[PDB]
Design a protein around this ligand. Structure first.
Ligand code: MAN
Ligand code: MAN
Length: 142
C-alpha cells in the first residue's frame, strides 16, 4: 500500500506476496504430513501421555485466563483423536506421496520464484533423502 507502483521494488514485493500463498499452503501440507508420518512410524502411548499433559496445561491456562477476566473426558477424547491415524497402507502411501510432492513444490518455488538457493537446497535434499516417488527424483537432482 505504501510502496509507489511502477517501481522495481513494488514489482518485487508484489511477486513475493503473490508467490507466498503457495509457500504457506505447501509448507502447511508438508508439515502436517511429516507429523503424520513421524507419529505413524511408531505410535506410542508416551506421545499420548505427553499430549494429554500439554492439553491439560492449556486447559488450566484457559481457566486461569477466564478467572482473570472476571478434563478427564476431554483427555480421553483427545486420546481417541490420536487413534484417528489412517489404519491402512494405501492411505499412508498417499500421505507420503503428498509430503514428497509438497517438498518438491516448495523446493521449486524457493529456487525459482524467490531465488533463495538455500531453503530450496534443504527442501530438495530432504525430498531425495526419503524414498522419492521415482518421478521427482531426477528433476529434483537436476
Ligand atoms: O487424495 C489424496 C488423499 O489420499 C488419501 C489420504 O492419504 C489423504 O491424506 C490424501 O490427502
Ligand atoms: C501432526 O499431526 C498429526 C495429526 O494427528 C499428529 O498425530 C502428529 O503427532 C503431529 O502433531
Amino acid at each position: 500500500t505504501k510502496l509507489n507502483p511502477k517501481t522495481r521494488e513494488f514489482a518485487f514485493i508484489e511477486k513475493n506476496r503473490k508467490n507466498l500463498d503457495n509457500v504457506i499452503k505447501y509448507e502447511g501440507i508438508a508439515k502436517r504430513n511429516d507429523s503424520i508420518i513421524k507419529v505413524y512410524g511408531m505410535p506410542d502411548s508416551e506421545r499420548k501421555i505427553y499430549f494429554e499433559s500439554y492439553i491439560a496445561e492449556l486447559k488450566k491456562k484457559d481457566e486461569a485466563k477466564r478467572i482473570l477476566e472476571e478434563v478427564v473426558i476431554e483427555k480421553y477424547t483427545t486420546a481417541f483423536y490420536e487413534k484417528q491415524l489412517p489404519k491402512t497402507q494405501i492411505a499412508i502411501d498417499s500421505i507420503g506421496k503428498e509430503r514428497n510432492f509438497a517438498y518438491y513444490q516448495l523446493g521449486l518455488i524457493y529456487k525459482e520464484k524467490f531465488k533463495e538457493y538455500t531453503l530450496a537446497s534443504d527442501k530438495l535434499e530432504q525430498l531425495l533423502r526419503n524414498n522419492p516417488e521415482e518421478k521427482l527424483i531426477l528433476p529434483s537432482m537436476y
